[PDB]
Design a protein around this ligand. Sequence first.
Ligand SMILES: CC(=O)CCn1nc(Br)c(Br)n1
Ligand SMILES: [Cl-]
Ligand code: NA
Lengths: 301, 306
Amino acid sequence: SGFRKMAFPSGKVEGCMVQVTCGTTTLNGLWLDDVVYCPRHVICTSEDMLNPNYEDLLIRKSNHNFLVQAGNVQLRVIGHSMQNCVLKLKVDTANPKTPKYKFVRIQPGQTFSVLACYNGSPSGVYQCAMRPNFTIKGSFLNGSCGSVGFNIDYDCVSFCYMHHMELPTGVHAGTDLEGNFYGPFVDRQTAQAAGTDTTITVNVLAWLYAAVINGDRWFLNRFTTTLNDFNLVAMKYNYEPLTQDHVDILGPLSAQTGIAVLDMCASLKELLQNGMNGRTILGSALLEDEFTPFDVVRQCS
Amino acid sequence: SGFRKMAFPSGKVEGCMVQVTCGTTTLNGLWLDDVVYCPRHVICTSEDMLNPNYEDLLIRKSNHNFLVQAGNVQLRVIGHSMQNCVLKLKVDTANPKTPKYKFVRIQPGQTFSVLACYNGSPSGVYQCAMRPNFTIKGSFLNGSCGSVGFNIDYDCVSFCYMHHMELPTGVHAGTDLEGNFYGPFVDRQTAQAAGTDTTITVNVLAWLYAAVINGDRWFLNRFTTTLNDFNLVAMKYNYEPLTQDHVDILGPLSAQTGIAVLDMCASLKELLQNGMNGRTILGSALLEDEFTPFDVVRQCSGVTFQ
Ligand SMILES: CC(=O)CCn1nc(Br)c(Br)n1
Ligand SMILES: [Cl-]
Ligand code: NA
């Protein structure tokens, strides 16, 4: 029993973190096989921030302009290329600690673990979710660029996020490991702003199912709802639309608990209307939206 | 910017987790140098657990009754003995992945990372506090016994917790790595209950400082207070007493933010007496008490553990 925001064990990623230095700029790189991946803005100078021409900046660099340090050891860079917003440095050593891995681009609502790193050394691990507005609510200080987000399903590490920047509201933006940004953001210091964020409805419902599995029923009610009436209500609270995909995804949790998905939607509608009236659900006084249906089944059962 | 509940990187501990089987019971062990540590209740049938005589039960086991697997390699157990509530299995090979480590016993209010494991395989990591009532609010399913809690200082892993049991309220009880229980619990299937818990005041204050550092300031006010006045309020709200050592420990955060501790206590007093009035602090509608002052400084300073 219990229910915690749980990260994946970080060891397989720890063995891949390196330091990348270019000029006066140092950030983190991810070393897999004989390639080190890092944000391409490592090659920017203080004059390049607003409108960098990365192709022009990169053609001026030699392999030996990139200093890559793995623990106490310099790696030799023997080649470089840019893919979208990530730099791929070929090095003359395959990482002996390379796990089974893949690169996966995730959708809003998906969760993943973040290994926060500074100067190529891991600092901490925490759990995040891709918000509907394509930002993440992380904990990142200067020097954290190049820290990565990942899942570990069955000893295979799926890398899904690399950290590039902090937006003025204090939330964070980055790319997949093919260097494509999540959301409308760009690696320039021109004014950009996240969209208004919304609550991840399918995740709140999953977490309510978690509460029932762990023995709490106080928030249920005798009512049901149509899917369309639910969405009409929930969007007035800045909740994401719930789709038939989401209803299908919640099938397993509905079968385990005996509570139909649209009945749980009626409970959520009432909670939005009433608040919690001094009670808690799984130890929270707010509705939690950073647990996916998959997360709940893996942690509970 | 940002503030998250954050665990230490778990890699150094993952390389120490093994699977320990005795009879029909499989659980987790911690493999350090040439010894595997695990809960002594691994040797009990469900009959035994009602009223175990552990010395008696262990007499009948040979080394070969202890099946230990490190990944896909079996380890050869060559000796066995108990220390308090932990079983120590001497094996024929030192763990080549043994980190620099120490066994430490933590105080209530202190935090640590838990590496939750099943069948010797790490499955998740999360951050816990030792509660005033000596339980932890963990997340554990059957098979998680022997999972461990730890902190990292430099390159040194300080092991402080080994999981033994779940209490009826769904919270968790365990030992230090020398087998001494945290709290008034015994490793036996008998009636046991968590005592009434209290809130860790110094940690709430730490978290309010974290909030201010992150720009969440609506709860600040013009007032200050005294230790004696505040502690009367804390007692009334089932908060732990604030001592002078607590105030000293928060000294750095007081100097950095410009909010004296008793200045911040006046904020906390008003929050206790009046609630949050529909507002949140660092995204929470509850007052969070599982970040220590050290946690807040570290996360707001980027300390690392390569
Ligand atoms: C010093 C910083 O703020 C980080 C460097 N950086 N360059 C770009 Br272009 C971006 Br986005 N971030
Ligand atoms: Cl996805
Ligand atoms: Na004040």
